[PDB]
């Protein structure tokens, strides 16, 4: 019992930091904490999110010794918004480059929504470099669950069409990001969240270029589908964990992951909606720790 | 006494929780706190309000062991905004289905403004399920006080006309929810309230569809008048308490309740306007807790 | 057969002129034509209108030798927008001062909507100076037809409440005058009108102060009610004509007028809604010419 | 050759009239011309259109002795915008009540977009009352052409999702009706049209309630699918003509119609996009007169 | 003598047609007239322009038997606005694909501003296919005239910096296209132009995506610089004409062209600023007809 | 290390004060703290900043007994926005007149961006009055580094062109100061800063006339180039310290200072971008305090 408590968890400010990494043309923003020599855990948000969605998971990961890296991927948050490169395979290259610049070679990888597609493209292109992979909330293109949501005309993906209308989507939503994003979020949540927390996301997507860059993730879905379907001719060898809330995709995250990897295990969060990190960070943190422990 | 203190009362975060209930068509948002096994007290806000109007009534209420369920009814606050179902009788059915969901099956009902019409419609359709009922601040359709406000062209119900203009009302007020709602509120209050508290209501009604959903409550008034007139031909058997501020509807809130229910008692709040839960919670809780003994 | 033809009728531009009259504080705008020596016919528009509503009536009146004066009353159109003076009795004084300044003293008087209240106040205060009075479309305050629309909560006066909200009405409608007024007009019309014609009205009410000044006509209704009830203790002695469309107030214009005058005759416009000069000017000009002859 | 010529054709003003029909609670606006005693031809526009889309077709129909009735259906143009009644079967009832008020019982019926769904529901519910039916540009719900566009996630129906979002669609598009509708239109045309003509439609949809009422046609699609599938158990007996542009649906209007009626004939307009009355009224006028003489 | 006459020249409407060409991903809009069998002349506008800038040149070309094709290149006017492909070499590929789709393969080519960069990239990549090339008003990247404007910080390219700011440029200029573009045009003109003509351009750049697509032409300049410097290791073999107004770049169009081609001839337009087709179409058509003959 | 901490440092309220100084034309706003009798340290911000950029440098500075005077120069922050005087030399004269007002007559000067041009112009015109001088972050006009940024078309000075467009820059950015300034800032930083701190700058430049006044600083650049070139023919006699972040101008801030002054020393701040007082105050104060021994 208790009303929603907005903001970063107590003491977060003291341990975690905001940092920037210059890559070949693109600058990525990320939040990193924990011991510098520890096993690196890279966390990838989705749409419409930033690194901030991991605010309640990052402390616990770091309190078990890991080197936490929460990335604003290309086009999101405080990261640069280049013209293109929003297909998920190339965005995985951005994350790999960041990781290499931070001195690492093998990483644990957690992604949700758009971020779990980037994470999969990371594991598919450089499988030796991903020790363990955690897949949250959303199916990846190329899977059967994905093709079904599309062929059924699933009401939950009504926005795929709109987001893929270049310039039109931006013209409609500019100036109404808070109203559009708060409604998008609340229709898919089950645990009550604080408006001040969701407004952190909405305000990021109101910054110049943030709407456009976010929508280009959706505009690359056809290219991602063709690319990911080729990726799925070699199932992943590393251990994979699949999680989703019972009031949204649930079990279908584990069904989806088993089309992509040989070593799969999964759980469904009780009384939890689409935003696992926002709604049920305790369940998520534990599952990641039990999963990341040998 | 001193200046208005905005926000939830101290310690409120710790004791209450926000929850959702999925019904067939609609998902309803509600706030609860206190022991689970206790007698349930259902609170129904009005226009232009949310559950937040009971912020000073719910703590004390469930410090005495009551199960407090403060509901955003269909279309308000964080609840869904469906196409229809905005007649007050069907809205009562939504509240019953949520009550049934929570495991209860008989409760104590308190309502003001639109909520008191829902609260009455609840008691009228399922008399057995309402232990008691507290009518606050506003008369219900079908009563004489309601019909006399209409015949008087009472200055206070000036907004009935505008709110009943579909699309026109939304077009005029969209983007001006704060200015419209703060003025609507301050013109009907007597105790000075904080802008920050009124802005909580205004911001909810600025949300997508919230203007339309609230205005459809007014667009259903003719249907409610016919329906409530049928309900009042069977006077309520339960004890009923009527309260209103002396600067607004005063004692005709009591007179209105006598038209509907047999076992009625009432009081008039001193130096308080239209918004009893906001203006004088102290008088109100104290009145509620005694009534609830 | 035919699509609506917007604008002034052919030849209007060469026969009529826009003019201003400076009174002691207020400058009034008016359009005039016909012989300088002819019997003067004063035409008073209402809300949301200007002199332009008489555009299809004025040529025929001028061809029959009448001196046509279509006035933008205080606060409307191109006239000044003073702070006050929007009670109808004082606005009749404005029209009388302009009439005296043009060298006339006895006049034929035609009014609709707000203008028929001004026109009645003119006739009640100076009955010897009004030769004949024609009353269109809307009842005047103080009559039982007026009180009956109010007590019934007639849907067609929903806007009384909103317009009487000082500052709120202006804030809601500023910048949306075209949408608000076009909708107001079409919901009450029966003959299809051209949007370009109604926008001439809407554009006038978008000019600085025009919204405020027009709503002050509505904010003065209680004072008009008290003032007109005293006027109605003495029925009007001059001949009176009552007209309205069969699809709007119809015969109630004649019922309303018989409480106001001893010598009343009336007719109902066929296939006509609320805007007699806009919808059926052919019927209106014929009835006026026969009445004034 | 020639540049686009905007507006009504010469002489239109003296030959047609704007009229209203009061139904039991809703008022409908329509434009009518031609002989009072002639065979009635009812024309039903779609989204985002009004009667004005038939401006180049109504003169030729009326000069051949037909009584033309181009209707703004419920919620569109100058018609009333009630709360409900936006399922296509009920909207056909509105059209029938207005035809009956004009003294007619037998009509030729032409529809496109949403109007062809109303026109089909008219013929399905009162088949004896429809002499001939012409179906333009768009498939109706329940057909497999309709169901295959849905299962493909066909890019040309991207807007079905957005339009079905109550309040979100109105909030995003209010104040941008011109930019939204001009783009919607030009992306589906092949013949160059004048901006002034499309703006006539866009300005109608900027009117109070016109966006909401238009989107409720789309929010009623599930109910239309159930209702229309039942309608197609009994194929239509009257002669049916199917037309579409080769650069849009083309021959699939012809396939779609053959699932609905026994006596079907069709043609495909050359070098024509989605908006047959706007783009190639010469072809359409020729096709309708030949069909109505037959 | 004469005030500026806005719009298309008389008879243009009956002689030319707007058409679309679907390429493999992009649909291009273009205006064409003259004999279907004539030698094809392709005209490429720049920023902030559309095909409409050739309105006073196309009739004379068509009367002399040329097949006129005035193209809205990728991202401009009524053409599609794809995500990328705004480097000038790829945009030349778009124009070539449209030319091949119209049944032609050898063409006369005219370009100004961005279009002269596209036109040069066309000639550099497919020199056998360009019969003659006419270069107007603006230097192309890679030349010393281009580098000299950059190193000098020429005030006339102040906008390069702003247009290369992705998302920032769009946010600043969205909704103010008319003020931004009219000012840009008049500061560089010498002959007075009609505001209605320039607004045809401004209104195009206000349509969805048009601002973004046009600025991507500027954001591709570094890539164009690298690509064109490689192209300039082989001077163009076909005849080249260089033109600019005496009040703008003047003889520097001929200096720039001589770094690009072996066979170059040039002239300077009298009493002409930056917009040769808008300001002095009479001089431009004469020079083009003599060059192509 | 951890997350950015927005606002003034703890205890700041207590130790510093806001004051105004009326000069002949203009009133200047400035912040001060520390002992009155101490050596005065003058701080000059740049674009787009106010005194607030020194919030982490001024405390420590005057904990060592310095007299800290952080000035909003002519046109910035809470200072007046006159018509002219935006060449950097005259702005130095304004700073001197304020220094004279405060009773001092020789001081220590620290400046960045526009302030370092003012600070240099101060030392150039009255060499005797400046004890020492710390140049931060930006090269001054007339130097080679300045001239090479112009010839390179350095991507960082993209805004010189736009800011030099009178009325155009104000029209584009008015109402978009926060989005424009936050982006301008974050693109040039390396240490992550809080939006709340950057918004303080943005809100000042949203004030009436603040956009115009700041942009006139850029519109005077050609005049400053001529004036500073004259000043640099007499190399400065005072000790000069040059600092810049390694991710921005780095060591050419030192190279730039050697062009102007004889006794120069410098350092380059590690892992810091363009905004030394904002990004690494710690390195900066420590560097300043040592230099100031």
Numbering used by the authors:
A (entry chain E), D (entry chain B): 11 to 304
B (entry chain G), C (entry chain A), E (entry chain A), F (entry chain G): 11 to 303
Can you provide the manuscript's text about this entry?
Here we report the biochemical and structural characteristics of Cfl1 and Cfl2, two Cif-like epoxide hydrolases from Burkholderia cenocepacia. EHs that belong to the α/β hydrolase superfamily of enzymes utilize an Asp-His-Asp/Glu catalytic triad to open the epoxide ring substrate and release the vicinal diol product. Cfl1 and Cfl2 also appear to utilize a Cif-like His-Tyr epoxide ring-opening pair instead of the classical Tyr-Tyr pair. While Cif and aCif exist as constitutive dimers, our hydrodynamic and structural studies revealed that Cfl1 and Cfl2 exist as octamers and decamers, respectively, by forming rings of dimers.
